[PDB]
Amino acid sequence: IVDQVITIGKHVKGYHYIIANLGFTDGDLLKIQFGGAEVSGFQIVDYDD
Amino acid sequence: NSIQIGGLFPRGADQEYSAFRVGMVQFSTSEFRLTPHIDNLEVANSFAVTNAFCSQFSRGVYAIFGFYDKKSVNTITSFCGTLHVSFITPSFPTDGTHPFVIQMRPDLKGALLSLIEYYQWDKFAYLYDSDRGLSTLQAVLDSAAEKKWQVTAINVGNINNDKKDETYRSLFQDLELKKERRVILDCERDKVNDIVDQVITIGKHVKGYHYIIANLGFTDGDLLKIQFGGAEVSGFQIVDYDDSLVSKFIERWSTLEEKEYPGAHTATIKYTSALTYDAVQVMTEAFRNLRKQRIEISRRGNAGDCLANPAVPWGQGVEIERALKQVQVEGLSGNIKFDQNGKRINYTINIMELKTNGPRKIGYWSEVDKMVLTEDDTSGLEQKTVVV
Amino acid sequence: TNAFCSQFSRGVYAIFGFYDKKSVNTITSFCGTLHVSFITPSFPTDGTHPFVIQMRPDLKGALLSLIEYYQWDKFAYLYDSDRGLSTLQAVLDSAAEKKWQVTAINVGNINNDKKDETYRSLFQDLELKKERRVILDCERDKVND
Ligand SMILES: *[C@@H]1O[C@H](CO)[C@@H](O[C@@H]2O[C@H](CO)[C@@H](O[C@@H]3O[C@H](CO)[C@@H](O)[C@H](O[C@@H]4O[C@H](CO)[C@@H](O)[C@H](O)[C@@H]4O)[C@@H]3O)[C@H](O)[C@H]2NC(C)=O)[C@H](O)[C@H]1NC(C)=O
């Protein structure tokens, strides 16, 4: 879905995407890291522990 | 019969050498066969270029077909001009007048200029490459005073692959100071793909932006990634796949085995490879005209070292050059004919506009006619005009 | 190339000479492989090149710092093609970092017969923007003209 959002260019400033799963940091986020859209998610495996 | 010809290729040339072999097979008549001596070496190092040129000269070649980079242009031109050796190259044409060189690639500066005239651009960005030659950059800089444009030229060529992601993002953040939406990329397809990837990463490929690819390899690079972004992409293509000749050539090209001929099974061919094929054709027709006019070419052996205190250039090479420049044939690049200097005259460069369906032939340009073909939609798709 | 290989066959230890826009690539690639020392007072090569000693210092930063000192925002740049486009590329790249409107004209490729006409037409074309600040990147012999 993120790849498709990138292809259509709907990941720029203004858009807001919330990932509704406990796998936020396991998947690569660098492709939308610089798009502009504010992405938010959830993580159960805190690597800082 | 067996005409020894030189074949200097870069080590990274694969589809170009494949098209050279396909052209060698297609035009190997029983009247005479062209035997090529292939030398794969580093195109950048001018010392190795000089060594290979003097090796071919010591072997006794009649016409050298090769490529060159910004370092080797002067050595090749100054060696072929003095030693009277014929040279054929699909690379970028030399700036000015240079003899004994047949540049298969046509002149694209007027094409980009006429396209800017058609789009009516007054302020845009120009990301240029240093290795591709500053000829087009000088032409647009000189036109920036005749027609008064505010162009922002950036040398993106000198970037390191380690700091690649950082330099490109900083470049586009610096280009957002003027809020630039119109960008022209004067780079090779291999680098244009990276620039497009970075534009996709930063999200500057949405509606509003306009990107012009300033090279004859528009369809060679993958355009489907920016096909649906929203930004109107436009470029230039010399190898028109809609041609019946090009279609019949691609029919055999795709069916060829990928193991023996590298990069041949594809349906799209790079413009450099097609220009290599057409150069082989032009060489064959040149030697055929030399046989038709009963002009005997012969070396008997070798005159000696290219380096000499008495400069000894063999005369018959002039006739070979004249026969090369006189040939007017039809090939993958369209109409192929050369003038007294060796540049391409009377050519057909198609202007493509990437829509949602894909690459669309929006027009074509020539040396005499600027922006002719107004085919398909003539501004009549989704307009919605309410009659009051 | 002929003179360089003649000196190499003679047995020189270090060659002191000059080069033009055409021959530079031949010299650098010949001294680099044959490990022969070269010294030249001409313009420095763009980038890093070994076995070459350029006596001339780098002037790009001097012109850039002088433009910063004079506080110029819109000017003309009449450059020479034979003298190398290094300074022109440096000022074009700085024209986005510091945002300048530079009008670069290639005055280098002009004929001595049509000299007065090409120059008068160039300055008449530069009066469209009413440019008063001009930078001349040419050799002294041409700067006098
Ligand atoms: C289809 O193709 C035809 C042949 O290729 C072409 O006819 C050519 O037309 C052009 C312009 O009309 C002619 O160009 C001139 O060439 C002569 C020398 O041959 C010169 O008068 C001049 O160039 C000179 O040579 C140098 C060029 O760099 C330069 O140093 C000189 O100062 C001077 O400029 C013109 O450029 C050309 O000769 C014609 N060819 C022939 C064989 O007669 C058709 O126009 C073309 N048609 C279409 C529709 O494309």
Swiss-Prot record, chain A:
Q: What turns on this gene?
A: Down-regulated in the pyramidal cell layer of CA1 in the hippocampus by global ischemia.
Tissue and organ distribution = Detected in forebrain. Detected in dendrites of neuronal cells. Expressed in the pyramidal cell layers of CA1 and CA3 and in the granule cell layer of the dentate gyrus.
Q: Where in the cell is it found?
A: Cell membrane; Postsynaptic cell membrane; Postsynaptic density membrane
Describe PTMs of this protein.
Palmitoylated. Depalmitoylated upon L-glutamate stimulation.
Q: Specify the glycosylation sites in chain numbering.
A: 38
Partners and quaternary state? Answer: Homotetramer or heterotetramer of pore-forming glutamate receptor subunits. Tetramers may be formed by the dimerization of dimers. May interact with MPP4. Forms a ternary complex with GRIP1 and CSPG4. Interacts with ATAD1 in an ATP-dependent manner. ATAD1-catalyzed ATP hydrolysis disrupts binding to ATAD1 and to GRIP1 and leads to AMPAR complex disassembly. Interacts with GRIP2. Interacts with GRIP1. Interacts with NSF via its C-terminus. Interacts with CACNG2, PICK1 and GRIP2. Interacts with GRIA1 and SYNDIG1. Part of a complex containing GRIA2, NSF and NAPA and/or NAPB.
| Free-text domain note | The M4 transmembrane segment mediates tetramerization and is required for cell surface expression.
UniProt family annotation? Belongs to the glutamate-gated ion channel (TC 1.A.10.1) family. GRIA2 subfamily.
Its biological purpose is as follows: Ionotropic glutamate receptor that functions as a ligand-gated cation channel, gated by L-glutamate and glutamatergic agonists such as alpha-amino-3-hydroxy-5-methyl-4-isoxazolepropionic acid (AMPA), quisqualic acid, and kainic acid. L-glutamate acts as an excitatory neurotransmitter at many synapses in the central nervous system and plays an important role in fast excitatory synaptic transmission.
Q: What else is known?
A: The postsynaptic actions of L-glutamate are mediated by a variety of receptors that are named according to their selective agonists. This receptor binds AMPA (quisqualate) > L-glutamate > kainate.
Q: Any idea what this protein is called?
A: Glutamate receptor 2
* From-to range in the entire protein, with total length: 219 to 267 of 883
